[PDB]
Amino acid sequence: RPCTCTRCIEEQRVSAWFDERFNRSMQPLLTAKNAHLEEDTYKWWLRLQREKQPNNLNDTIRELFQVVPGNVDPLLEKRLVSCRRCAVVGNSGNLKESYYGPQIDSHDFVLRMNKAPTEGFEADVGSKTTHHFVYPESFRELAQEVSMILVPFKTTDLEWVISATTTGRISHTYVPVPAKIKVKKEKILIYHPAFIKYVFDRWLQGHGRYPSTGILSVIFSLHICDEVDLYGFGADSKGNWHHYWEGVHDGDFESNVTTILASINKIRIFKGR
Ligand SMILES: CC(=O)N[C@H]1[C@@H](Oc2ccccc2[N+](=O)O)O[C@H](CO)[C@H](O)[C@@H]1O[C@@H]1O[C@H](CO)[C@H](O)[C@H](O)[C@H]1O
Ligand SMILES: Nc1ccn([C@@H]2O[C@H](COP(=O)(O)O)[C@@H](O)[C@H]2O)c(=O)n1
């Protein structure tokens, strides 16, 4: 249905560059229904981190959906709203003294990532979080309201969700990872591995080894939201790349994708300081 915002990200024939890349049939979250991967997609995904002798994926996903919800709506019930407005907050130190907190919090969803804190940074980054993307090597404890979106880069990452909410047996991947987390099982969502390959193939055109968490978060919000505003992406005005509180990816090519999306009004970018 056409959205009721000023513009709608889904709208075709605004930009053929967007229409070529956006695929409305993509499902960005894993469910029991959608979890079968095509062989080529599965082989691509195993190659990202090259784990030795991974456990069978369908067995892992079965066990995963004994623990966390296995029948989420893949677009997080976007069907029940007419205009969903989202803020996607990256980690750039361009948010320092930006005073973007209130405008960030004014959105329906606020999506954060990795170990980025809000505590003590609220005036700049906001206090609201509806969804927060993590992987085992870049988790921090989340407030209890917050949906955790696990972005899996290897079979162990799904195993880790199982373990860290239950037995606490996985404490190491390529680095130490938390053996337990406090996040409630009902608040966990799983980014679909096929949607990672869609991001890589169609949005990044095969640039990088695989997509960064920032660009995965952006394309995910193109699908789940009608209006998307980006904060904390890019360097600051002095050209520094640092975090606001403290190769594998092609950051130039990903940056250019977000610049082009902004130019066609499919997102807005707040550049900060
Ligand atoms: C910097 C880099 O290439 N990181 C890769 C690498 O990481 C390591 C491997 C072995 C020991 C230490 C590290 N490490 O702490 O940097 O290889 C792993 C796979 O074994 C990852 O691909 C690292 O890349 C990170 O992956 C995460 C997702 O796990 C995320 O994409 C980060 O953006 C990326 O740097
Ligand atoms: N200086 C920065 C810092 C982070 N970022 C974005 O925020 C996302 C998460 O940052 P971290 O991986 O450093 O936690 C990155 O993958 C990137 O797209 C950015 O675009 N500019």
From the list 143, 139, 138, 179, the residue with the least C-alpha distance to 162 is 179
Neighbours of 120 (CB within 10 A): 9
103, with CB counted inside 10 A (0-12, 13-18, 19+), is middle
Rounded Cα distance between 27 and 90, Å, is 23
| Helix, coil or strand: residue 212 | coil
For ligand 1, what atom is nearest to the CA of residue 210? Answer: 31
168: three-class secondary structure by DSSP: coil
Query: Which of 82, 85, 72, 33 shows the shortest CA–CA distance to 221?
Result: 85
Burial class (CB in 10 A: 0-12, 13-18, 19+), 42: middle
**What is the 30 CA–ligand 1 centroid distance (Å)?**
23
Residue 147 β-bridge partners: 131
* DSSP secondary structure, 137-149, as one string: TB-----TTPEEE
The total number of residues written for the chain in this structure: 273
Determine the distance separating the centroid of ligand 2 and the alpha carbon of 233, expressed in angstroms: 6
Instruction: Show the domain range for 263.
Output: 1-273
List, as one string, the DSSP characters of 238-261.
TS---BTT---S-HHHHHHHHHHH
Residue 68 tokens, joined: 């966390």
Give how far Cα 189 sits from Cα of 40, 134, 135, 150, 259, Å: 24, 10, 12, 6, 28
| CA distance from start to end of the chain | 38
Deposited resolution, Å: 1.5
- Is the CB of residue 212 below 6 angstroms from any atom belonging to ligand 2? yes
Which residue in this structure is represented by tokens 């007419």? 82
Would the annotation count 239 as a binding residue?
A: no
Which residue has a Cα nearest atom 20 of ligand 2?
Answer: 233
Q: Return the HEC string of 25-88.
A: CCCCECCCCCCCCCHHHHHHHHHHHCCCCCCCHHHHHHHHCCCCCCCCCCCCCHHHCCCCEEEE
DSSP class of 120: T
Q: Looking at residue 119, what DSSP letter applies?
A: T
Round to whole Å and give the CA distance between 216 and 135: 12
Pairing of strands 188-190, 227-231: unpaired
- Report how many domains make up the chain: 1
Residue 68 belongs to domain with CATH number: 3.90.1480.20
For residues 137 and 162, give the distance between their C-alpha atoms in angstroms, rounded to a whole number.
15
Rounded (5°) CA angle 245-246-250:
95
Write the residue with the smallest CA distance to atom 25 of ligand 1. Answer: 248
